[PDB]
Design a protein around this ligand. Structure first.
Ligand code: HEM
Ligand SMILES: O=C(O)c1ccc2ccccc2c1
Ligand SMILES: O=C(O)c1ccc2ccccc2c1
Ligand SMILES: [Cl-]
Length: 393
């Protein structure tokens, strides 16, 4: 009576065509057993939300990828923020929270909006640009590392580093294994930029470091908390911004609606996060016997959370399959929900806003003239190439 399923939600065929299979996983019960990996999973908005909002029953401190840390050697020592539970999680959540506050945002928005306008300009003069490498990658890349206060050298490694991390959450398939064995130079690069002297003052890196001086964090914890933003900080957004553009490309009218009202910018990004959901999936582990979606699940059980699914659940969302920029997007789980809810959402939104804001004032049409190509990854959903023509306003 927990229906089994052959669906492998970490398979290349699944990533290419997720959406029919997701539907199955919601209409198969509110709780399902994937025979493939021996793990329970919940796909509906209903359950997903509940799970995220009960950290006590569904802890994160035993891994939020497949591998239970209670039993297995992590591939690296875990997050202080992501793979920790209240009480422990509160301190580093705090320190990160301050660092990335709407205060901190105000002091940097202008820079971000400026570069956002110049990049849409730069591209418009080409015409045929690749919406990923020339925009979704390029724009985040230009701004975010600088905003961290990183060196120039080495930024090659950022996306491959974050991809590794995001791959390591999945099951021990090909994507994952490969990613690990190619990993060393990426890490060695990141571990280097987390150290105090390599972070220019002003940047999130140094702002984070100051917390060592007050006692707020230790100096061992200091670099670990930076690593944290260099894992979760870029790929996600690259992928979000890319996702957005993909939308306005497939929904011409909805673009006209944005051009017409460019103050809907921020919200157009958000609905895009709902609509594609960059971070697709994430595990928890039970800490007691818990009754979930009608079923009783024993403790120390892994539960997979289908975050994308939740965001497209017909049961919670009117017309889940449509990119509608005016939606009440509040409630979507694209940045998670509850205590771990993306501590960086603001930066992401700042980015997505100004970018889409610029696109709005400056561009007239977006057409996909090319072969569109998909970057596969156990946890991240996004594109590798998206060839577009860009009509100038
Ligand atoms: C638009 C792209 C982004 C998406 C879709 C996204 C998604 C998420 C999600 C779903 C979670 C919850 C994890 C969980 O519940 O276990 C989360 C947490 C987190 N995010 Fe993001 N994020 C994005 C951008 C960012 C940025 C720009 C930063 C850095 C400033 C960031 C840093 C973090 C960190 C450090 C956590 C752990 C939070 C905690 O445990 O309290 N993310 N993010
Ligand atoms: O997301 C990426 O851009 C990316 C690129 C190369 C990657 C190589 C190995 C593992 C993950 C990777 C992710
Ligand atoms: O603290 C980290 O290293 C870390 C790593 C990967 C992460 C992935 C998504 C969100 C937060 C993350 C934090
Ligand atoms: Cl690492």
């Amino acid at each position: 009576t927990i229906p089994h399923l052959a669906i492998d939600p970490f398979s290349l065929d699944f990533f290419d065509d997720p959406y029919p299979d997701q539907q199955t996983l919601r209409d198969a019960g509110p709780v399902v057993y994937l025979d493939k990996w021996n793990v329970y999973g919940v796909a509906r908005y209903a359950e997903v939300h509940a799970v995220l909002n009960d950290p006590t029953t569904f802890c994160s401190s035993r891994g939020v990828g497949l591998s239970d840390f209670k039993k297995e050697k992590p591939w690296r020592p875990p997050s202080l923020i992501l793979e920790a539970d209240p009480p422990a999680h509160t301190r580093p959540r705090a320190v990160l929270s301050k660092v990335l506050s709407p205060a901190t945002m105000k002091t940097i928005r202008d820079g971000f909006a400026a570069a956002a306008d110049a990049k849409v300009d730069e591209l418009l003069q080409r015409g045929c640009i690749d919406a990923i490498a020339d925009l979704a990658e390029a724009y985040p890349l230009s701004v975010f590392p600088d905003a961290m206060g990183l060196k120039q050298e080495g930024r090659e490694h950022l996306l491959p580093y974050a991809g590794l991390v995001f791959n390591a959450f999945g099951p021990p398939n090909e994507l994952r294994q490969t990613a690990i064995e190619r990993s060393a130079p990426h890490q060695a690069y990141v571990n280097e930029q987390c150290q105090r002297p390599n972070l220019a003052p002003g940047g999130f890196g140094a702002c984070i470091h100051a917390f060592t001086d007050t006692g707020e964090i230790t100096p061992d914890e200091a670099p670990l908390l930076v690593r944290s933003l260099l894992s979760a900080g870029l790929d996600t957004t690259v992928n979000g911004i890319g996702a957005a553009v993909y939308c306005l490309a497939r929904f011409p009218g909805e673009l006209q609606r944005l051009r017409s009202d460019p103050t809907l910018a921020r919200n157009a990004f958000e609905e895009a996060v709902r609509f594609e959901s960059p971070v697709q999936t994430f595990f928890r582990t039970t800490t007691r016997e818990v009754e979930l979606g009608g079923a009783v699940i024993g403790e120390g059980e892994k539960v997979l959370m289908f975050l994308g699914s939740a965001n497209r659940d017909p049961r919670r969302w009117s017309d889940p399959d449509l990119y509608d920029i005016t939606r009440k997007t509040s409630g979507h789980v694209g940045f998670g929900s509850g205590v771990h809810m993306c501590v960086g959402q603001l930066v992401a939104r700042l980015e997505g806003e100004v970018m889409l804001s610029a696109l709005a004032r400056k561009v007239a049409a977006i057409d996909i003239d090319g072969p569109v190509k998909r970057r596969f990854n156990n946890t991240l959903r996004g594109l590798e190439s998206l060839p577009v023509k860009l009509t100038p306003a």
